[PDB]
Design a protein around this ligand. Sequence first.
Ligand SMILES: [Zn+2]
Ligand SMILES: [Zn+2]
Ligand SMILES: [Zn+2]
Lengths: 115, 49, 13, 137, 118, 154, 756, 112, 105, 112, 109
Amino acid sequence: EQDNRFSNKQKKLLKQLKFAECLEKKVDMSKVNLEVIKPWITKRVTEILGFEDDVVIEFIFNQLEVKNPDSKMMQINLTGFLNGKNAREFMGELWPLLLSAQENIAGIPSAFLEL
Amino acid sequence: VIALGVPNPRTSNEVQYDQRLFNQSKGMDSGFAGGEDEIYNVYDQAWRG
Amino acid sequence: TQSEIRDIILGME
Amino acid sequence: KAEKDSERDELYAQWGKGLAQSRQQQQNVEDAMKEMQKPLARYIDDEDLDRMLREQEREGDPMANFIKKNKAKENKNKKVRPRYSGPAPPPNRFNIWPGYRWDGVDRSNGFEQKRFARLASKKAVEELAYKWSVEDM
Amino acid sequence: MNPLTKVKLINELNEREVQLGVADKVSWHSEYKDSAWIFLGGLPYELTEGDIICVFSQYGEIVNINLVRDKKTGKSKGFCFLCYEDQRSTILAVDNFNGIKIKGRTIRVDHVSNYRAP
Amino acid sequence: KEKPSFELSGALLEDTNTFRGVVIKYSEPPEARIPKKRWRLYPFKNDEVLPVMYIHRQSAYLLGRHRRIADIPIDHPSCSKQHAVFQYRLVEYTRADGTVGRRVKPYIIDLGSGNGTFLNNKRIEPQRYYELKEKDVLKFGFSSREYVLLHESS
Amino acid sequence: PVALLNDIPQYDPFAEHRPPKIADREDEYKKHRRTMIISPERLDPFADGGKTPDPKMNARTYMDVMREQHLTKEEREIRQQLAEKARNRPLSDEELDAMFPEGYKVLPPPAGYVPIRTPARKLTATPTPLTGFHMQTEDRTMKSVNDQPSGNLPFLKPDDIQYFDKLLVDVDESTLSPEEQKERKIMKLLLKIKNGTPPMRKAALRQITDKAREFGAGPLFNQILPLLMSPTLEDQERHLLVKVIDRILYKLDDLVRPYVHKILVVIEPLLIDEDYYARVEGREIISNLAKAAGLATMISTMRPDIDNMDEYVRNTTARAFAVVASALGIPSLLPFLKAVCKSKKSWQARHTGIKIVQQIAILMGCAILPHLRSLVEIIEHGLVDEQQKVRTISALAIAALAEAATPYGIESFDSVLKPLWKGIRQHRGKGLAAFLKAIGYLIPLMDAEYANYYTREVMLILIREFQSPDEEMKKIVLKVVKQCCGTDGVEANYIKTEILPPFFKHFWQHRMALDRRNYRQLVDTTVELANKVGAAEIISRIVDDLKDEAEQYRKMVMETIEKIMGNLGAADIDHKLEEQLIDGILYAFQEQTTEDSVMLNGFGTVVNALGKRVKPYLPQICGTVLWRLNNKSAKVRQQAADLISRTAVVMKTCQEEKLMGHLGVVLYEYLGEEYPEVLGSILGALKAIVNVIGMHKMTPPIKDLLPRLTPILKNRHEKVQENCIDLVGRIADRGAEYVSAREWMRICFELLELLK
Amino acid sequence: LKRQEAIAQNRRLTLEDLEDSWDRGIPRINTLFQKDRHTLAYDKGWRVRTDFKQYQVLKQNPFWWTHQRHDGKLWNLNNYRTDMIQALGGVEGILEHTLFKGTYFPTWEGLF
Amino acid sequence: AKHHPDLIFCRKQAGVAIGRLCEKCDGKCVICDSYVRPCTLVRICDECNYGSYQGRCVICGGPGVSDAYYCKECTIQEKDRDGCPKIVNLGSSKTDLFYERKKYG
Amino acid sequence: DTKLLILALERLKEAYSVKSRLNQSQREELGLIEQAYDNPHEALSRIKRHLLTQRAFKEVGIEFMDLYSHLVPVYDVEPLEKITDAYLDQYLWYEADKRRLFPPWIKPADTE
Amino acid sequence: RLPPEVNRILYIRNLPYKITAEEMYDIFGKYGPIRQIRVGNTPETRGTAYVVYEDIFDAKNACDHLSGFNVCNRYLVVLYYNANRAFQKMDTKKKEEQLKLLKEKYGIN
Ligand SMILES: [Zn+2]
Ligand SMILES: [Zn+2]
Ligand SMILES: [Zn+2]
């Protein structure tokens, strides 16, 4: 904002991290039902953590409810709470499920279409 | 018989001193300036006050 | 005022 | 009605002007009247002051035993309310005796004592400052 | 502003007037010379009158005591009004007892201006 | 619910005579002191003597079966929880010349025990100070062991 | 009775000479500052570009931290339960290995030394309570023991032995085959920084700030942080140590990623601290920390502390959060906020999130406007909550936000005027104070057709709270009154009738003067009431206090009267009022035990506002000033030479020839004073007269004045040097011919040493 | 005896049973109560030490035999000033000889 | 101030609020740090002008008494066109001297 | 140790009680006393160092005080050593009198 | 009635090298119960000892009394320990298992 002697650490990670695979196809949120996903997110993380962390839950929710989310930024922000590779796998697992739900006509992922 | 179960004032019967006695003089040198003479120190009060 | 007080105390104002 | 609550609230009004200072005022006014009915100049023969000085009980003397005897004998026969009795209370700037149901322990915060220290210390520093002013002169 | 700050501030009032060198006649207590009532607050909920009196009688005879307890359960709300026998004892008590720990709870004292009976 | 009492509550006595989570009932008088005559307690268990107890370096010693507080744990279950107190209390007297002075003497006091404290195997009236003299024997509860009181020169 | 002389009625005597320590300013709440310990080592998640983690690490992570925390919470839980059923508490083998460092062998000496310990504790009643001349046998050992680091190192105190004891035993370096151990010792030049002359400090600082990268974070903070947690550390030492942390924090940019929480655990207490510069420095290094270790690190690091069970760390974490929000930007942190403040299990987290919001408003100030609505919606779910605490803190945060967004954002607050205004009526106690603060701050931000109704409703409650004993209550209604009863949408007569009487009965007391924030707040709202109801009313209310006994009180009323008349002017001061005013002014001037410009500026402004109505008083003024100029104490003489220099404009403009020549030549006579502080003000007064009555009619002519001053130029004291060269500059500039060329060359040569 | 009385009474001696003997006694009993009584309980050999100061300082001390904190203040000469003024004629009889009326101070009690 | 490399400007967009000087700081430029030929007035960022910040020394931070200017050299090189030149950080020297004093007396 | 050090320094300061023009050496000494007041544990450390290691010292100066009937010699020791010697002086007298090294006939006694 | 920097763990230097553990134990049990004792082994720590007492008052009056004790031609230099950092993790598994014991045994929940 006012300082020059510090670098943008986000951009630095934007260069120097190892990211997930589905993180390219931009995604909109109008086309999505979330309240179907929400329990999936909850159980996913709660297992990753062995306990429940409401704040991480709501963090992911709030980062998603935007018009179009940045998968890069989201993987970064979860890298702290989860163990880094867990974040890569988790995001590259949810984001394709997002693509599925969004090309679905009801907006729901094919996993819960089947189940 | 001496009544029990009353609280404890941690004080003794030895002579103790009313705190208004103490501390009304202070210093650790004699009053003689080390034997300096040309100072005016005859009296120990101001004249009228 | 102070002068007034003085006068009251000294005599007549 | 108004009469009952009058009783109650007048009682509370004295209790908020709490009694002790009120009876002190009483003895003040009667002292002023006794005096005002007397000359301006008090000599050393005035019967009041002579008698008072006689009864003035000073140290050392073995009359003190007989006289303390007299008065501790008589003032036993009184309808007083109880007074505190036990290991000496600490000192307070107004010399007020504890109530008769104080359980002895001293619970203070350490304020009376630091006040006493502050005053003694100002005395010491006044001597020092006088000495230094005139020393220079 | 929790009551422990209201303790700290009364103590600050005292030691500040000390630093300023105020005469005993223009002490902040002088505004209260017509009331022998102090308020105690923060008291623990198990202390009774007997305790409040055995504690606060150190500075005079206590003429009136008013421990304010919740009417439904009868249990103390945790504060009291206390009427000494001489206003000067209220001076003493406010200076000396404000901030003492009784059973962990650090009680607090201050005068009362225009007490209304209950 | 309950009324405005005028009676006490264990808060005061609690906060003052608390110690290791057991409120103590007895507290040291104003006139306690530490003795210069160095007194000693000789314990016997039925003619088999025990190691000696040198009790000259406190102002009082409290004996009870509650061991983690008391000085001398009496451990024969007839022994109270807080049973008795040795206590050197400075008392004055009239010397041969009538000049008054003070020597600190040892006294016993029962803290209201169940069974009682036996000085000369006489049960005493609890909550009073009994003066302990030379060669005297003391017996606690209905317990086996006895103690004789002496001082180095005696 | 020489034994009575050995018997002392009722130790270290150097206290008055030793610099104060920080750990002495503390309370029972700040005493929790040392009760915190450096956590073990912490794994950073961004290492190896986001590796797949090889386990068997011994390096904590988010999960480990949370399990520790929740385990401990359950620990306290069952402890309190069991304590219902029935610090010194003994510790276990791994506690002992957790607290001691390495290079240590553990041993009970015998099984009998363990049994000795068994009998030792059991019965310690003396089994026998156990000299003379002996000649001594000469030796070397006590001579041979050394306790100061040999070399050119400073003196190592008798308590930092704990931190620097490794420096005492000296052995060759290559013996220490760990080069980690070599750099460890060489980095304990921390001693040379902590204690040291300024040369040592400068050199060691440069050395550490150059060798930082090579040294690495680990070694550094492992040595530096226990220092900062030491209980005896005083002020300057801490300032130096945090400056060290600052510079190395700037050199190592990313590498701090594992140490951020430790640094925080140590620096956070600076945020709630009495020394203003401590707070500012802590704020600044937390900002640089947030910039260096980016968002995700800070978020992940300080999340588990929102939910902590010590209010201490909840509070300081909240404030730190607001700092990293200022440094990184709200839009990046706002989702995390929404999260925490809407967490539904724990109300502690809700409290702490709402409090972070409050702190953001306090700190960022103006910059919240673009996000105002987002914040207010974050927070409005609190004004309705049932747990009283979070209600109160939400009202406070609303007031903070409104203050940070003065006039703007009212349509953002729109959603919230309802919960407040109904909470007001059916509330009582402390929530009443909080909601009052809030509504008061909104009342300015509102359009008249709203403010009129809201105001005329609120003033009803206000009048009732004028009798409130609570100190926060009284302070809140002072602020409110200043805002509410000080708009354009009220009518003077209502105030004059209904506010002033109980205002002056309940607020102008001595307790208020004695307080430091209540002082200024009462001054401000009294000046506002003056602005509405005119000066004459307020003044006539408080003039008789200029003759009160408490000086702090007289100075309160002088500060208001002065500020008022500065704003409004004295057109409405009648005769009797200007009389009582000049009288109180004089009296207050004649009693100053203190040193302060309050009464001086009071005099100056009151007089220069009365203007030309002060002619009939200059003889009393002049007479008093000449008489105080002859007093025995240099405080009053110096204050009387000040008053002259202030009223030097009036005394001329009203043609005081007798009196003004009086002043000129009397001052010239005092020019020989031997108190530098009195002489400086005499010189200031002389120059103040020279400015109004010009050079060529000064009573002691400039021809006599300047020669009198050239010997004063040698005075070496700062006040007198200041005023002297100002006067000589005037004369040299404008007079300049009443003096000889040789006087001017003399003064040249005397000036060449004021350049010092 | 007074300390033994204070013990028999459990009370404390006030300033009042020691204002009689406050400046008597020849360690000067009011030295028991000064501010540094504690540190001055550690000063031994002070008489020899002040005697031997003649070999260190180039002045010659007329009060080598005494110390004001250890002995007390052993003389009080305050009546000398009062009686000297009354013997020289009073302050007015004195100020007849001076420039006091040239100063124009109204009364002589404030001068300094 | 061209003397202390450790400090920083607000640098955010200008406004209309004139800038003010403390009495220590009175008379100098705000970048060039000169003492002469002042030409144009200073305008400060609204944020750095809001609230308690009104009427202060841009440089010192104390009570502002006089209007700040730019020297003719700053005006000619156009260094007056960068938005709020308020120093937003205290520096080492203020707290440093403060601590040296508070230890001394 | 700190009580004995403060007594030593008060003794050393009594000399310069007046504070005339004095000079460079006396000002050196005033500085050393003042700083050993400011940091007492560094002094104590230096003192005990000297008592352990130091066995060759500086030269003293000498001059005579003229009493007109006889001359008195006056010695001038360097101030760092003066501090060590004052401390050791006080310590020796304290301990010697606590163990009663001197029997009661040796008489500049503190009692009379 | 204690100042908080008092600890039940104190740091001792100026010991004789190689000093007999039994001496260590009784020298220090001239005060009460010793919970644990560690002597340094690496030459840098050689000659100093951390001593862990089982009683607050024991440790404190030890630090009051013995500080200034001379054995073996040197005064025993002591200080309180500042146990201000941890040195390894507190082992969640066994921790929660022993508290699970606590709860299973005493029937809280
Ligand atoms: Zn400035
Ligand atoms: Zn410029
Ligand atoms: Zn700006």
